[PDB]
Amino acid sequence: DVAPLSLGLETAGGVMTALIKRNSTIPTKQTQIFTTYSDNQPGVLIQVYEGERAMTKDNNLLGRFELSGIPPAPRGVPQIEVTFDIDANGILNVTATDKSTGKANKITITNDLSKEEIERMVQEAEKYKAEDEVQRERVKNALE
Numbered sequence: 001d002v003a004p005l006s007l008g009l010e011t012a013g014g015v016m017t018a019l020i021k022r023n024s025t026i027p028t029k030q031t032q033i034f035t036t037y038s039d040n041q042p043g044v045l046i047q048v049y050e051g052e053r054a055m056t057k058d059n060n061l062l063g064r065f066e067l068s069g070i071p072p073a074p075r076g077v078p079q080i081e082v083t084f085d086i087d088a089n090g091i092l093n094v095t096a097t098d099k100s101t102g103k104a105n106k107i108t109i110t111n112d113l114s115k116e117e118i119e120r121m122v123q124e125a126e127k128y129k130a131e132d133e134v135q136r137e138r139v140k141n142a143l144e
Contacts, residue, residue: 002024003022003024003086004113005052005121005122006050007019007020007084007092008049008084009049010045010049011034011141012144014056015055015056015139016049016054016055016056019083020084022122024086026087026088026090030083030084031081032141033080033082034082034141035075036076036077036078036080038144040073041075041078042068043067043069044070044144046082046107048061048092048107051125052121053124054133054135054136055135060121063107063109065096065105065107066105067098067103067104067105070100071100078098079098079100080098080099080143081095082096091108091111093106
């Protein structure tokens with residue numbers, strides 16, 4: 001019925017950027033536009049995470065994929081359309097599309113987390129909220 005944890009990707013500096021918030025009713029789909037952190041960046045590495053912590057290293061890695069062939073441009077210029085989709089079965093599909101070329105790549109996360117594991121993660125996020133925000137502040141929608 002609901003997404004037990006927020007689902008997002010890593011933005012520059014290892015920042016957790018959530019596309020689907022914890023407790024969102026499913027099926028659900030959210031889209032955000034991202035960009036490159038470096039000049040003439042030829043690709044973006046999409047790193048899929050689940051959890052409530054501000055930094056991705058403190059959340060659970062679900063999977064990674066690369067989107068290559070980004071045409072040369074200054075940092076912050078390319079437009080990468082990222083869509084997180086949860087179907088009726090609770091399965092997550094993540095797609096990244098380069099708006100200039102139309103090139104897309106995707107990953108489907110399979111469940112081949114218990115109530116206590118989810119509760120531990122939510123509680124830990126509440127306990128370390130300040131340390132987490134300090135780390136986030138020092139390091140917007142740019143991807144590496």
